[PDB]
DNA sequence: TCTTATAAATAGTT
DNA sequence: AACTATTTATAAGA
């Protein structure tokens, strides 16, 4: 972008909405590419500020969600805090 | 656990 | 990158694995930023080629999945085909 | 809503 | 597993 932004809540509603649309498409496009490049199945569930649901699935949402329910093994689990901790670890 | 249970419960029934 | 790659499955196992790890972190980072910039809640479920599960949630995976189950409305739903169709809509 | 200057992600090398 | 040159994504303008 023209300028580096801080990761913090956008106050201007229009800007936020504009950002939301563009970055969501951005995010789904990165997920498409990941799913194709590395033969992955991916599901993505987003609730905006207005609790409206936006979903993406590489192929079929219900297939992924059920396979999720069948999973019984300890696996990788990440949250915003993990990501933030991982970024502080390496700035350069 | 119970959440996994509840998810499968609602995808099924469709 | 050093070169433009085609979006198509990577055959070299090591490359694929290397790409997978980097792009997954990439994807989770974009998800964190979306969730903070636009005050949205996000869950992400990935099954790799080996059907191993990797998951991310902005805050709490179980909270998002339950709110998903409670959703009772037509919403936006996208697949790889939508993305690919939209990439012809754009271009240059 | 487009366009583009600049920031951020990443493919290939080593 | 580093590094960086290049590609990609995107913030701010218009």
CB contact under 8 Å between A65 and B7, yes or no, is yes
Q: Which CATH number fits domain A13-88: 2.30.30.140, 3.40.1810.10, 3.30.70.1400, 3.40.1410.10?
A: 3.40.1810.10
Nearest chain B residue (CA) to A72: B1
Say which CATH class C13-89 falls into.
Answer: alpha beta
Nucleotide nearest to A4 (CA to C1'): D7
Structural domain boundaries in chain A: 13-88
Q: What is the stated resolution of the deposited model, in angstroms?
A: 2.1
Long-range contacts: C69-73, Cβ < 8 Å, 24+?
A: C69/B6, C69/B7, C69/B9, C69/B10, C71/A53, C73/A53
Report yes or no: A31 and A42 within 8 Å, Cβ to Cβ.
yes
Give the separation between CA A45 and CA A25, rounded to whole angstroms.
13
| Helices C13-37/A80-88 angle, 10° precision | 110
In the numeric block, which tokens belong to residue A36?
């194709």
Return the H-helix or E-strand segment holding C56: strand C53-57
Q: Is A90 exposed, middle or buried (0-12, 13-18, 19+ CB in 10 A)?
A: exposed
């Amino acid at each position: 972008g023209r300028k580096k932004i801080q990761i913090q809540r956008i106050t201007d509603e229009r800007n936020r909405q504009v950002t939301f649309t563009k970055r969501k498409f951005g995010l789904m496009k990165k997920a498409y590419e990941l799913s194709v490049l590395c033969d992955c199945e991916i599901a993505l569930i987003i609730f905006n500020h207005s609790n409206k649901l936006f979903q993406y699935a590489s192929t079929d949402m219900d297939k992924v969600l059920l396979k999720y329910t069948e999973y019984n093994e300890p696996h990788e689990s990440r949250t915003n805090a993990d990501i933030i901790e991982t970024l502080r670890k390496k700035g350069f | 656990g119970v959440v996994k249970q509840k998810l499968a419960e609602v995808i099924l029934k469709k």
